[PDB]
Amino acid sequence: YDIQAWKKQCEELLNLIFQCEDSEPFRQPVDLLEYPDYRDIIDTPMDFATVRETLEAGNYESPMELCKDVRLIFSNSKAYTPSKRSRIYSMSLRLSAFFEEHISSVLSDYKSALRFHKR
């Protein structure tokens, strides 16, 4: 029922994601020189360094907000891909599965802890 525990749990999961070869394309904001149409296609670019910095700045209130930004990384890849068989897109789907598998307990514990706090 620790309502603060999500933050270190998210730091640890981000560390695992950064160790994962599949995160390579998503570690930093898209190179708009190599992809000059990218900002035509994608409204809000997001990457894992921006998520980590936002967390470490104390600018997430909840793991739901972090989860929304990580999901935006994956939806941006899905929107920008020219093919469902693209290398970068395919890396996004495996990394998304990994992230969802690990964030579910972080979300559940947080929401349980806040329900207990408000009981």
Q: Which residues bind ligand Y0D (CB under 6 A)?
A: 25, 27-28, 30-31, 34-35, 77, 80-81, 86, 88-89, 92
Least separation in angstroms between CB 82 and ligand Y0D: 6
Least separation in angstroms between CB 38 and ligand Y0D: 6
Which residue has its beta carbon closest to ligand Y0D?
A: 77
Residue 11 in tokens: 């730091």
Residue 32 near residue 47, CB atoms below 8 Å: no
Burial class for 70, CB neighbours closer than 10 Å (0-12, 13-18, 19+): buried
Residue 50 near residue 29, CB atoms below 8 Å: yes
Nearest to ligand Y0D of 77, 96 (CB atom): 77
Least separation in angstroms between CB 44 and ligand Y0D: 13
Least separation in angstroms between CB 29 and ligand Y0D: 7
Question: Which one-letter amino acid corresponds to residue 28?
Answer: Q
Residue 73 in tokens: 């990384």
Residue 48 near residue 18, CB atoms below 8 Å: yes
Nearest to ligand Y0D of 62, 81 (CB atom): 81
Nearest to ligand Y0D of 8, 94 (CB atom): 94
